[PDB]
Design a binder for this molecule. Structure first.
Ligand SMILES: [Au+]
Ligand SMILES: [Au+]
Ligand SMILES: [Au+]
Ligand SMILES: [Au+]
Ligand SMILES: [Au+]
Ligand SMILES: [Au+]
Lengths: 171, 171, 171, 171, 171, 171
């Protein structure tokens, strides 16, 4: 590739893996989003919250696809695995699931950064620092805030908890 | 009638029946609307919600009266029966009553569509598809959402449930 | 009822009767409105005139339902009887029918006022004076004007009469 | 054709026939339009009314030509037959002629819909439902309204009838 | 489910299958979009064209997820399979691949419509007619137009063909 | 006819012939317009060019119908013959066909002018001079320009010719 420079085959491959992971997270959030628009759940702001989290994840994945092409790597897509559940059980359980998901995504991004460092690729390191690492920290912190409030409010069993959290925090 | 074409007498008669039904549903919703403005109920947004549902139903009935005339049928009105109750008991009970009502109205519209198909009347079939069938599905879904939230919140016996649902969801 | 004061059970019952009557008049006018949009009648401004008269009557009925609740009475709905005819025969015959209808409605409102006086209920008396009695007089006078012009013009048998009245007076 | 899918040769041929019919109706209305701008007829609003009906029909025909190409069919034009008359005799006779024309066009469209159903072509069925069937019903109803008023007014022999109908209804 | 009415388990299952298919098509188009932003392809308007086609497909899939919930069905996601190729070879080959893809998607939607008809579900039939069937026909027609022009221009081997098509048609 | 003056029966008849011819040319151009929106032709600006030429021709025909009525002649319509071909083969062949068509139309208009002169009808002569003769010359000149460029560019066999002419000249 006539543009390739300082771009290690392991980095290119790790980027392809992160693209699949970030697409998977997008898919998890889409599943969650339409769980909360079920007639027997009907928490519309939970629904909009996770839909927005889905788009953020799709944008993360496209930016990595764009990075692959900018550096002369070659995008290789894999299946996007279905989420672990279709029934996300409650607003609290979904938020806790999102938190676990974002920490796994964050672990992968951190390992991708360590690889970039090992290979002496400061462009890739800065790319992750500038667009991913702090977004992940903000996302994880926000999900932690929500989990805490939902637990403190008595979710899932206190009938008013998820309803009121839906209308006040997520509205 | 010099405009009548492909318009079966059974369809004309079924349309007259649907007009009475859609007027009845309008009357049920009007009853519900003024139940919630009682001084011993005083849920003003429940009141406005059902009043709006009443108007939607009056518009449905007028559109069917208009269809009758467009096709050369002849409108034949019948008594509009009083609702089953004047005292609708609670916000939850009214919402559940509306849901049952809308499903019966939906069943009638679906049977009217099947008649139109049997008689080869695609204008009538499309009329129902375009203005009634999806409106009924949206309406029924919304009432299901509300019923679910009210139950989850502990209505009717939890004193805060209908009050908070009134101010947050229906406001 | 913790709001009830100076509100006689006969007044409450008479109000429920007037609600049914005012809803009936609304139904009569709706029937008339869609008679004039028949392809073999097709007097669109007669149609709009009676449709407007129908809404005025629905608003009268809702205001009485509202009054019932303001005073602590309890709304009790009855069947809304179908109009005496589906075929209103001509613009003149419909106008004459409306005039008779409004005079009967006016008689009922006047009897309701006399009851309010007998029971010493000046709030109810003023309510009727402020929102019903003069509206009825304006309505009856207008219908008399129209009946007179239609007769003078030679309706129903002079072919130009209802057509020209439709376009000039009711447009 | 690399776009053709689920598109039956009988439907393609029936569409070509409907294109000719809808072009013919356009031609009939053009003939009528310039009959009423004759110095010995001079009903300018009849003229504009039928000219507008002509354009609606040209747009119907072009939409069917467009549908043919969208589905991969092949447009085959035939002669556009001259109207049955150049002298349309009166405003009433022209309106009655338009009504008969629109009912024949409507019959053809309904038969085209039944063919689409038989061939399992829901795209074609919906196309007719969405753009033709209800337009035809509105058109036929309107022509019925006009015919009725013109007859009631005493057209064609009452000298004021077509003149006044021209200025009031069609202006 | 308290909202479910006239909704057959086979329709619910077929809808889940169509959701996976429409998500797959979205994934195919995303793959194509980032193939054309490769430094050794660099047809930016091909890239934007297929990216737009990807979003249209994501919106189709979300609307079906929404329909599932409106009708009381239950969304069940499956893996989204990777596209058949990462290297789409040329602008012509990608357009031909999109055409084949859209015809397969169209076949599935048509089979879904036939199922809805068999089960007497006119809401589902109309949903497909209103939002999918004609969009598919427009899409397939457009891809056919593009394939034709690219072939006529001498793509893929004429060096100016895809470049000029990119700048003129897709810009 | 009380308006007829200096209007020769041969002129009236020749005008009726020109109306049919100008309607025919309109029909030829409509055929051409929808040939270029075929999926295996797909030259959208050729399509819009000939559609515009079709409307110009319809306006020419209506103006002659209007002239007939202004002068007291009587419009007599004949069948509009189908075009010689449905398949117009190429952009060049269609342009050459339009050129031949416009020259025949021009010959007819010139012969109509010579008739007007012979009959001493300067109103008819000026009508043709003012609205037809120079429009025909502009039209024929433009078609000649296009034919020349298309030939010089190597149409129909050079794949880029009609495509580039479509986007640059006709856009
Ligand atoms: Au991500
Ligand atoms: Au209704
Ligand atoms: Au009243
Ligand atoms: Au037509
Ligand atoms: Au799709
Ligand atoms: Au012409």
């Amino acid at each position: 590739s006539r543009v390739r420079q300082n771009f290690h085959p392991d980095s290119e491959a790790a980027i392809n893996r992160q693209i699949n992971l970030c697409l998977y997270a997008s898919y998890v959030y889409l599943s969650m989003a339409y769980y909360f628009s079920r007639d027997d759940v009907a928490l519309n702001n939970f629904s909009r919250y996770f839909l927005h989290q889905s788009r953020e994840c799709t944008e993360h994945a496209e930016k990595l696809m764009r990075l692959q092409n900018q550096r002369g790597g070659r995008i290789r897509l894999q299946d996007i695995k279905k989420p672990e559940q279709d029934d996300w059980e409650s607003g609290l359980h979904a938020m806790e699931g999102a938190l676990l998901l974002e920490k796994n995504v964050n672990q992968s991004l951190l390992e991708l950064h360590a690889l970039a460092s090992d290979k002496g690729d400061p462009h890739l390191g800065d790319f992750l620092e500038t667009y991913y690492l702090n977004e992940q920290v903000k996302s994880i912190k926000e999900l932690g805030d929500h989990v805490h409030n939902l637990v403190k409010m008595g979710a899932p069993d206190a009938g008013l908890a998820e309803y009121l959290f839906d209308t006040h925090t997520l509205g």
